[PDB]
Symmetry: C3
Subunit: 376 residues, 3 copies
């Protein structure tokens, strides 16, 4: 395409530095003999190592769109460009123009090119993968609706790359954003809007409704959970592993005996918008095929679950906004705050530094662990 | 042994390329002088670096037996074999046969060998340790008895290596498989086997036993836990840190005042098969020696605990089976399912891909956070 | 300073090996021509790569004080010292003394120096960052007051570096040490000290106070939590995002309507020593500025929270003591125990080895998942 063509040009540059004196002006070249051929073999093995490493670490599609320019890949592209153009200029001005008759020096120049390309590959993987390993900072990520918070540890990243790592961990650690679990407090606040220090005294002696409503709601959730467990066990017990039928029709056969209890449990825990009937039938046939217990079937539906269990059009990644005060290409430091705003919520992330820890030693004699039975 | 002998041959190959013209046919060699000696010193430092790195990253026992052939170590062994045999053939056909009189070229050939061996070591650690760092995929691992599930993040691994990482995390994250916590549902299902849409209506209006049995069982567990805490505190209070006695006899002295309450708590939570009396005495003497609180002693027994707290003959690793549809040497991709079957359960693992995330920016003026006290 | 001056000397050593024959004794040097100049260009690019990599991975302040000497950095410093002193001795005894007239060999000697310095940098990052990646051991860390325990996975570290990783994870995973949550058991033990097998029988039939005290305390905590949620919602509802006022004065305006309920909740959960009024006002203005819900404000105060949320003078890192039996520079192995003693508690850490896992395969026909509706 584009980058493959430039990679082909960089890969064929040392070979083109080799092949041109045995093509253009053969009648003048001194015989290299056994000096040149071992250099050719070493060049071939180093080009093979470079091709295998380049395929291993750089033949992959990009994974994110970052706001500003990525600094280190730009530095690597400028370095490779100046490097290859400088070698082509030195080959064209001195070697190819004046027709430098010793072929040994041209082969050694090409071997030095292949060596420096190998060290460019090493510097590339150092700048892109090894500087971020040693944990220098910690990050607190708080979602600004339910308050759920996680800590992470990162090295020397930029604000872009740290935000990308936080967004990687969001779909894995945090539960899915449920807007129906939040209206019960907003309706309560708008009910308080219908009607300072002295009023706060009359509030705490005036029969808290919230405790009894939470207790009654937890009792209803546990009762619906118990009836769901009974219905799913007595529904799974109706099929035998061996009329012969595929697992989709077996799921369709055992589903109408568990359907209404599951619908009532999804309504009582406010999860009815995440699970269609086709999703439940696909997961049911999945658990039927793999040979799973009814609790292994129900574990997807009992809890809230993380963001990436669900359908691909329910979680969304193509609209994230990075609110920050400084430039996002700057590295992390102690005491900065940046916000990852989604369409309805936000992840407030603040960074602290891992402190300077001083260790020392004690020399405890191991025979001092002998003691008595006196009343302590 | 075997691999140490081949490593010794690879390490002594450049030195043998050096030493043979100053042994066999000394009377013909031109004087190298100061050109050769700096190359000898650079060769010695590069061999020292190669030996230290080889000891640092490859002198260790293998950790797993994988079903099919490992692809990357086979590629590295084929690469090293073809490399060393090609250099021995080029040394024997051209240099040693024709007796190439310039010793400088032979020393430069050996230095090129040591350089290419260093880049082979670099390519080895790239293929074995650096390609798996960047998280490309996520994995859902569900145990098919109680439904307990974990998410993990992996890079470009094969199905073998991903299964090995899942089995690493199983002994650390998941609680131990307890078959006695599962018979209460199978007996209930077999009781339902003693005797579709209309029958599901009569079930949900017919006095759920499961909720009241769970509530009564939780009350009994909390009462036995309270009496266990009282017994363990009043048992630990009978010894003083200072008849002088070692911690084993102190554990034997304070154990008969906590033994029956611990036995009743292990029976009520169905953990009596995991903890013998000798295990409890060893852990008791451990917590006595290190100076730990009674709750620090009881935390091993209150919860279920992960798989690797227990005895080595209770968790088992020499029988795992990898059920998969495609070849297990293939890399991970989006939407595949593979099963790790143990002797009594299974880990169903399905792989999803981390999505393409698009970040953008907002430019919020920091003086817009000034606002009013009007009724919202 | 000191290390920057030595790094400048190491960086200027190859350039000083280059520049001295074109300064001291110019009248004798043979013309290098086009052989030397490509070596100069390759030398310049390799020095640039070395400088960028050295800045990327070694220009940072040290993060910890370890008890004994660090082995691998000492090995790297001895290696660099012997390397640079050996090249200066070989340059002074042979090249500079005898005035070696071929400048090509001197330039090749300098290029070999730059190559071996690049491999020294590679060996440095291998010994310091890559050997610890592959998980060989697991670690159980138990805090010896409340019993809270975590498992971690580490590679081939020393006891110093493993203790540093455990202390990194302590401020992130473990909740903060609260000494007021521990006196209720010590007062109970001292009450039992006011007054063996037969006495343990009379205890378990004598009205456990602890269960009813825990149930009543949990009821009081839930009631104070409910009134706190009501007070914080009706306090946040009194401001509108738009007299115009900054968020500090908005926090001061809405704080006296939530203050007493928060004070009662911090007293009932024994957290009144961690949160001053200024900390609550700063966090309140933080959540007001970022636009967070009242539950997002309260999540800092509802739970106990990890160690590093709080003030820098509350958690302490400059007094940790490493109690161990063997030398702390030794590597990890299976079955060792070391203790990290803080001023009032201790982390007992014991190390187990990740077991040798044997995988095999099953070949299940995918058409065997067709089955019947017979009564199981």
């Amino acid at each position: 395409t584009v980058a493959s063509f430039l990679g082909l040009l960089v890969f064929l540059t040392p070979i083109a530095f080799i092949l041109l004196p045995p093509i253009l002006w053969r009648d003048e070249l001194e015989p290299c003999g056994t000096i040149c051929e071992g250099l050719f073999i070493s060049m071939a093995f180093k080009l093979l190592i470079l091709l295998i490493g380049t395929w291993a670490l750089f033949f992959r599609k990009r994974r994110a769109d970052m706001p500003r320019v990525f600094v280190f890949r730009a530095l690597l592209l400028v370095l490779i460009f100046l490097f290859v153009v400088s070698y082509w200029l030195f080959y064209g001005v001195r070697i190819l123009d004046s027709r430098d008759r010793n072929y040994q020096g041209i082969v050694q120049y090409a071997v030095s090119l292949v060596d420096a390309l190998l060290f460019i590959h090493y510097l590339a993987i150092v700048l892109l993968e090894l500087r971020q390993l040693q944990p220098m900072f910690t990050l607190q990520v708080v979602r600004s609706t339910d308050g759920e918070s996680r800590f992470y540890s990162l090295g020397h990243l930029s604000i872009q790359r740290a935000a990308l790592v936080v967004l990687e961990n969001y779909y894995k650690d945090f539960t899915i954003y449920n807007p129906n679990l939040l209206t019960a407090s907003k309706f309560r606040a708008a009910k308080h809007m219908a009607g300072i220090a002295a009023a706060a005294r009359r509030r705490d002696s005036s029969h808290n409704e919230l405790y009894y409503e939470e207790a009654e709601h937890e009792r209803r959730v546990k009762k619906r959970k118990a009836r769901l467990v009974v219905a799913v066990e007595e529904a799974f017990i109706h099929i035998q592993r061996l009329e012969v039928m595929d697992p989709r029709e077996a799921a369709q056969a055992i589903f109408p005996s568990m359907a209404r209890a599951l619908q009532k449990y999804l309504r009582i825990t406010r999860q009815q918008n995440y699970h269609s009937m086709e999703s439940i039938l696909q997961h049911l046939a999945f658990c039927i095929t793999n040979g799973m217990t009814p609790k292994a079937f129900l574990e997807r539906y009992l809890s809230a679950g993380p963001t990436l269990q669900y359908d691909k059009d329910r979680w969304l990644s193509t609209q994230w906004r990075l609110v920050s005060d400084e430039a996002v290409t700057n590295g992390l430091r102690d005491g900065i705050v940046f916000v990852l705003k989604c369409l309805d919520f936000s992840l407030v992330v603040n960074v602290k530094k891992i402190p300077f820890i001083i260790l020392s030693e004690e020399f405890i004699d191991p025979k001092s662990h002998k003691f008595v039975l006196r009343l302590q």
